[PDB]
Symmetry: C2
């Protein structure tokens, strides 16, 4: 599995899927069928589509959660399978509700290459988490409880963003859920998304409407491609999903 | 990190903490202070206590989420650090507040579990024992149903039972169960009673049914074990357990 010996320190962040097909183990039918798209370094691409579309499979493949046998996924023009897995994962950070927190200090949860307290604070500030952390009796040295359940969900999402900002990965995979601090998160995500390549499993209207490109995934294929304005003009699948607020 | 060359295939499941102390990196204060307890193979031990107690740190240490430098944690009398990490993790399964699910079939999500491959028949047996068979078989594609949104297509009760099925399939001799402080709550309680049979169980506990049926309860308070017993012996003491129990383990 971890056969690759090549590394990018850091990668510029250019992504490309070229003729990618994928089927789950034990299934003949394809989950993804001849997927091709390119994301220039520093751009944001929102994957939208109904549940079951395969949009999440596309995102999962970027970090080799599973490998393909047909087509290629390239990072800076090199097949992702050719990179040392640890380096691929260092270059491509994931943010999802599945962010693992654990009993330890807030600082250590953010730091989970060593970073200084200064660097950790800067990451929390950019993530709109500094204000709630510093008001706490012990600040960054506060020990979280119940492996993260002591914090609110909005607080947990911002720690996940801080953790991502600290690593400063050139590629970000953001999985949006279909919040009391929602405004703060949107600003935090706008900071996280700046100067890096972002692939979003998207549900927020603000994320989608501001993406450089939107790919509408439908039964394992790309049905429509454009941005919010060009896709609305088409009066097709994007426009309909948008009307229903990406709740499909 | 993964310096150990020893393996148990499988371990019997005897656990022991002997004089264990632990502090988070960069902290002077101890998170756990001179923790000592034994769990004979096949017994269930419930760790109870208020948020911040360190009960979850105890559970996290069993699978080497972090390592100690004072005292020892032993599996079948061998320090956990001496086992190949992959084998320690094969012997000690975790049912976490949040189990990692992903776009793929229900069967592949259940099988994600162990090192060796399992048959469809073995996967079905695991789902049955976990009270997940009925909801999976009523579905249009049954076990071949592809979950969506990396698990969000399923209900939370359904996701917990898949985590239990996943644990039953690997049949690990040690189970670490983290209870959250449900529409299919009854089904889960029976599923957990199946999962807890014939294996060593360490529970970060909140359910009254789990706690009242544990072989031993350890009340953790500010990084120390304050009380030890079972539901009946601890109630007799009219102390910390009784008070926590009176508030339904919501602390
Ligand atoms: Cl420092």
């Amino acid at each position: 599995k971890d056969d690759g010996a090549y590394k990018a320190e850091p990668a510029k962040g250019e992504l490309e899927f070229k003729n990618v097909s994928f089927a789950y183990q034990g299934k003949e039918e394809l989950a993804l069928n001849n997927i091709s798209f390119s994301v220039p370094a520093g751009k944001t691409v929102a994957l939208v589509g109904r549940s079951g579309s395969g949009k999440s499979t596309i995102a999962n493949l970027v970090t080799r959660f599973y490998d393909i046998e047909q087509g290629e996924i390239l990072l800076d023009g090199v097949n992702i399978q050719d990179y040392r897995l640890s380096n691929l994962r260092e270059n491509c950070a994931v943010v999802s509700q599945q962010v693992h927190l654990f009993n330890d200090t807030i600082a250590n949860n953010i730091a989970y290459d060593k970073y200084s307290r200064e660097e950790i604070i800067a990451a929390a500030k950019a993530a709109y988490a500094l204000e709630f952390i510093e008001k706490l009796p012990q600040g960054f040295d506060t020990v979280i409880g119940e492996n993260g359940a002591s914090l609110s969900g909005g607080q947990r999402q911002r720690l996940a963003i801080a953790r991502a900002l600290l690593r400063n990965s050139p590629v970000l995979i953001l999985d949006e859920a279909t919040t009391e601090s929602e405004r703060a998160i949107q600003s935090a995500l706008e900071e996280l998304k700046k100067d890096r390549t972002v692939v979003v499993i998207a549900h927020r209207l603000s994320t989608i409407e501001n993406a450089d490109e939107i790919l509408v995934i439908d039964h394992g294929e790309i049905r429509e491609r454009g941005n919010h304005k060009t896709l609305l003009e088409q009066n097709g699948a994007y426009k309909q999903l948008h009307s229903m607020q990406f709740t499909g």
